[PDB]
Amino acid sequence: SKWIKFTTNLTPEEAKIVQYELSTRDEFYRVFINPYAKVAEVVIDDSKVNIEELKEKLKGEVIEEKEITLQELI
Q1: Residue 2: Cβ within 10 Å count
Q2: Which end of the chain is more exposed for a tag (fewer CB within 10 A), N or C?
Q3: Spacing of C-alpha 21 from chain mean position
Q4: What is the CA radius of gyration of the chain?
């Protein structure tokens, strides 16, 4: 899996991420994002590498911080 953070803000922004990683089609897989909760923690199964993901979430970038793309925490 991956546990990456994001922007905790706009319901229709935790929505925009779906389109950015939508290009990631045959590799982008299990997605769970919360465009409701301003949480911005994404545990996603996606097997590209994610360096492109890193790019797209790097467009919000305001407070998206660290690429500790680990499981979850514990």
Answers
A1: 18
A2: C
A3: 8
A4: 11
Domains and CATH numbers, the chain: 1-74 (3.30.70.1750)
- Closest by CA to 58, choosing from 17, 23, 15, is 17
**Pairwise CA distance, residues 74 & 52, whole Å:** 25
Q: How many CB atoms lie within 10 A of CB 23?
A: 9
Contact 58, 64 (CB under 8 A): yes
What tokens appear for 21 in the block?
A: 């990683």
How many of the other CB atoms lie within 10 Å of CB of 69? 18
Task: Say which experimental method was used.
Answer: NMR
